[PDB]
């Protein structure tokens, strides 16, 4: 229904991110520290849970 290089183009902007453990914010994939000052630039991140 959708073609694969287009779904990869969409999911580099929608899925393929990092998400911070505190504050729940959305970060670039090569992230080590959060952007938000609300969590104190914290260090513990996770990737976004991929869809099934």
């Amino acid at each position: 229904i959708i073609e694969p290089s287009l779904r990869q183009l969409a999911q580099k902007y929608n899925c393929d991110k990092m998400i911070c453990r505190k504050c729940y914010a959305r970060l670039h994939p090569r992230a080590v520290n959060c952007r938000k000052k609300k969590c104190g630039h914290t260090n513990n991140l996770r990737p976004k849970k991929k869809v099934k």
């Binding site: 959708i2 779904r7 183009l9 969409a10 999911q11 902007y13 929608n14 899925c15 976004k48 849970k49 991929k50 869809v51």
Partner: peptide, 13 residues
């Protein structure tokens, strides 16, 4: 909606 599934929109390629 689930942004991880509804992957629509114009995106910079």
């Amino acid at each position: 909606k689930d942004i991880r599934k509804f992957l629509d929109g114009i995106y910079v390629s």
